[PDB]
Specification:
Assembly: monomeric
Helix content: 25-40%
Largest sheet: 4 strands, antiparallel
Distance between the termini: 22 Å
Entry title: Solution structure of Myosin VI C-terminal cargo-binding domain
Keywords: Myosin VI, Cargo-binding domain, Molecular motor, Actin-binding, ATP-binding, Calmodulin-binding, Cell projection, Coated pit, Coiled coil, Cytoplasm, Cytoplasmic vesicle, Deafness, Disease mutation, Endocytosis
PDB class: motor protein
Oligomer: monomer
Shape: globular
Structural class: alpha+beta
Number of domains: 1
Number of strands: 4
Strand content: 25-35%
Radius of gyration: 15 Å
Order of helices and strands: HEHEEEHHHH
Name: Myosin-VI
Length: 129
């Protein structure tokens, strides 16, 4: 069943990491746009992904659809966890998620059965009201 897929009984971890682009990093100390990478991992994998770059629009990625775009490494295989407190709050993630159009993207794959009902999709269904 739908809920059977989502199943809100797994691990939920959200993180973020503000890293500067190498190219801009050295070519110009001032002209070094900072890119923020956030990802809401679920258990050993992830279900929500969002990228923000001063030069690159809000790249909203999700499991199933942008499985190749989003993080392709388990929590330990990611690195954000190893960092110095990469974790974050769900309020911030959903803050930007709505600030751009993540829900719309999810609702699109959700209906097309591409979003892969894992957790965000269900959370989205509730976030719709």
């Amino acid at each position: 069943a739908r809920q059977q897929e989502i199943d809100m009984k797994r691990q939920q971890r959200f993180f973020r990491i503000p890293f500067i682009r190498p190219a801009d990093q050295y070519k110009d100390p001032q002209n070094k746009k900072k890119g923020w990478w956030y990802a809401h991992f679920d258990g050993p994998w992830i279900a929500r992904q969002m990228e923000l770059h001063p030069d690159k629009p809000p790249i909203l990625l999700v499991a199933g659809k942008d499985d190749m775009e989003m993080c392709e490494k388990n929590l330990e295989e990611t690195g954000l966890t190893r960092k110095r407190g990469a974790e974050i709050l769900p309020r911030q993630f959903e803050e930007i998620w709505e600030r751009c159009g993540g829900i719309q993207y999810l609702q699109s794959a959700i209906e097309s059965r591409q979003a892969r009902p894992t957790y965000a999709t269900a959370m989205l269904q509730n976030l719709l009201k």
